């Protein structure tokens, strides 16, 4: 997960690595926080 | 850069440079970006040469630069 303005930083990345890395681009924290969580809750909270 | 009258930018390329590919209140980095244009054009010439002139709009700039270095304070 890499920021949106870093999309044109990718040209020095090796293509053999660039073909190995499913790079996602993001604009906002709300894009990340529904991308990385598992939707169910596991542990009880504090409250 | 040793070039002659065989490649030229319009001011569409100048708008492309000022819009994306530089950010400064001076002309040193603009000089360096135009040097990048001249060196990429000279190497692309000496590998495979075109004929006469070659006009550079905003289409030919990302084929020579690709990489923004100072993204501007829009």
From TrEMBL, chain B:
ADP 2 binds at residue 28. ADP 15 binds at residue 28. It is found in: Cytoplasm. ADP 6 binds at residue 28. Induction: By heat shock. ADP 11 binds at residue 28. ADP 4 binds at residues 28, 31. ADP 7 binds at residues 28, 31. ADP 12 binds at residues 28, 31. ADP 10 binds at residue 28. ADP 3 binds at residues 28, 31. Homohexamer. Organized in a ring with a central cavity. Belongs to the peptidase S16 family. ATP-dependent serine protease that mediates the selective degradation of mutant and abnormal proteins as well as certain short-lived regulatory proteins. Required for cellular homeostasis and for survival from DNA damage and developmental changes induced by stress. Degrades polypeptides processively to yield small peptide fragments that are 5 to 10 amino acids long. Binds to DNA in a double-stranded, site-specific manner. This is Lon protease. The lineage of its organism: Bacteria, Thermotogati, Deinococcota, Deinococci, Thermales. The gene is lonA1.
């Amino acid at each position: 997960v890499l920021p949106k303005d870093n999309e044109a930083q990718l040209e020095e990345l090796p293509k053999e690595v660039l073909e190995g890395l499913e790079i996602k681009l993001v604009e906002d924290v709300g894009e990340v926080l529904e991308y990385l969580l598992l939707p169910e809750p596991t542990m009880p909270p504090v409250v | 850069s040793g070039m002659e009258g065989r490649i030229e930018v319009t001011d569409a390329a100048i708008l492309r440079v000022i819009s994306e590919y530089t950010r400064e209140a001076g002309v040193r980095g603009l000089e360096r970006e135009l040097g990048k244009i001249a060196r990429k054009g000279a190497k692309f010439w000496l590998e495979g040469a075109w004929e006469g002139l070659r006009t550079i709009d905003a289409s030919d700039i990302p084929t020579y630069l690709g990489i923004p270095r100072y993204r501007p304070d829009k």
